[PDB]
Design an enzyme around this catalytic site. Structure first.
Site, mmCIF file in Angstrom:
data_model
loop_
_atom_site.group_PDB
_atom_site.id
_atom_site.type_symbol
_atom_site.label_atom_id
_atom_site.label_comp_id
_atom_site.label_asym_id
_atom_site.label_seq_id
_atom_site.Cartn_x
_atom_site.Cartn_y
_atom_site.Cartn_z
ATOM 1 N N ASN A 164 0.844 -1.206 0.000
ATOM 2 C CA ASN A 164 0.000 0.000 0.000
ATOM 3 C C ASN A 164 0.879 1.257 0.000
ATOM 4 O O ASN A 164 1.975 1.276 -0.586
ATOM 5 C CB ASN A 164 -1.030 -0.082 1.130
ATOM 6 N N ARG A 165 0.384 2.338 0.593
ATOM 7 C CA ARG A 165 0.948 3.669 0.343
ATOM 8 C C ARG A 165 1.970 4.116 1.343
ATOM 9 O O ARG A 165 1.885 3.839 2.544
ATOM 10 C CB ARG A 165 -0.205 4.686 0.330
ATOM 11 N N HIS A 191 -1.912 -8.913 -2.549
ATOM 12 C CA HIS A 191 -3.079 -8.295 -3.163
ATOM 13 C C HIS A 191 -3.999 -9.372 -3.738
ATOM 14 O O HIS A 191 -4.689 -9.155 -4.749
ATOM 15 C CB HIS A 191 -2.682 -7.310 -4.241
ATOM 16 N N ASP A 249 -12.412 -0.094 0.200
ATOM 17 C CA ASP A 249 -10.980 0.132 0.060
ATOM 18 C C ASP A 249 -10.518 0.588 1.433
ATOM 19 O O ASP A 249 -10.236 1.772 1.688
ATOM 20 C CB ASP A 249 -10.687 1.156 -1.022
ATOM 21 N N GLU A 296 -6.640 -8.548 1.648
ATOM 22 C CA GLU A 296 -5.203 -8.382 1.592
ATOM 23 C C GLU A 296 -4.598 -8.348 2.990
ATOM 24 O O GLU A 296 -4.681 -7.306 3.656
ATOM 25 C CB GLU A 296 -4.842 -7.062 0.886
#
Length: 322
Positions: free
Chosen positions: A72-73, A176, A229, A282
């Site tokens: 992820n981010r 993922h 999400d 995930e």
């Protein structure tokens, strides 16, 4: 009975492996993605497969089991660790983030193929010191080895992260995993009571909140009309018990039990607009943007490997006939 077979998958070398219960295909050149997983009792494909190679290359995190190192981010691609500032590429341009790490579209090597009466085993490995553009961002001698083992009705999927270099580094991993999910007739459950509040860049604010529908999420719920999400906190460290996502396919009468060990402290659930026919539960070792949260590592899941250390983070997918 069991087998391992070299095959060609959409023009690319791959390894098919299985027993009488389950068959997988892993594509080493495509980020060691387990692109196919078939329940042999029901003949049902469990994972979303690409219809062309070009489709996979377009979206290599939305098919099979993509490997997210780190997951992820990271805000602005930037974080500090023991005084050192890192700058990862900002590939998520609108939100100005780094997203999904280094390994999902690189070539991994096959290092083990073994069969016994107890399990069919395939191992793949990638050494990040051999990836010059990764070394520019993350100048560490990290090595990741995947161990895939099919035993009875389970695929075990273990990641061994190794520090072969001379300095410590922070790390996390996630997957993922993209399951076929007909929202009209399948149900989803998850071991989570709380979730992380996210800002408009999908980064945690640092606040935890109740999952409003948590009871339904424990029972098995219909995801129609829900766009997800969302970053869930695993309930395991607070409640003990299980750490898992479950998909129940009501028409096929099969349950997919996706377990993860104690390292996997968070789960992201992603279904795009809810109309694409897939669902991504995930498991992550660290929360989105963990490196930039002023919270303890018991909660963020941030881990550090000192020189010479390694650790194995375990997960598994079990198929049960209902």
């Amino acid at each position: 009975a069991n087998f391992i077979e070299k095959i060609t998958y959409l023009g690319t070398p791959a390894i098919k492996a299985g027993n009488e219960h389950l068959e997988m295909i892993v594509v080493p050149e495509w980020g060691s993605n387990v692109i196919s997983l078939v329940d042999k009792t029901t003949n049902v494909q469990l994972l979303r497969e690409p219809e062309t190679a070009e489709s996979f290359h377009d979206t290599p995190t939305l098919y099979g089991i993509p490997i997210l190192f780190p997951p992820n981010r990271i805000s602005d691609g930037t974080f500090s660790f023991r005084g050192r500032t890192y700058h990862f590429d900002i590939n998520e341009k609108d939100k100005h983030n780094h997203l999904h790490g280094f390994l999902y579209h690189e070539k991994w090597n096959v290092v083990t193929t073994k069969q016994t009466d107890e399990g069919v085993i395939v191992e793949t490995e990638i050494d990040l010191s051999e990836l010059p553009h990764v070394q520019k961002q993350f100048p560490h001698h990290a090595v990741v080895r995947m161990t895939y083992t099919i035993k009875e009705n389970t695929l075990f999927k273990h990641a061994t992260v190794m520090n072969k270099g001379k300095e410590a580094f922070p790390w996390g991993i996630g997957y993922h995993t993209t399951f076929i999910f007909p929202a009209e007739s399948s149900l989803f459950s998850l071991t989570a009571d709380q979730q992380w509040e996210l800002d408009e860049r999908l980064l945690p604010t640092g606040k935890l909140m109740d999952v409003p529908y948590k009871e339904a999420l424990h029972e098995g719920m219909d995801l129609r009309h829900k766009q997800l999400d969302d970053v869930f906190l695993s309930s395991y460290q607070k409640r003990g018990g299980e750490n898992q996502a479950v998909i129940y396919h009501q028409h096929a009468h099969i349950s997919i039990i996706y377990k993860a060990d104690e390292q996997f402290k968070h789960w992201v659930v992603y279904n795009a607009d809810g109309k694409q026919g897939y669902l991504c539960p995930e498991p992550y070792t660290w929360v989105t943007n963990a490196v930039n949260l002023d919270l303890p590592s018991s909660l963020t899941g941030l881990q550090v490997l000192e020189p010479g250390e390694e650790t194995t983070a375990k997960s598994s997918i079990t198929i049960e006939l209902n």
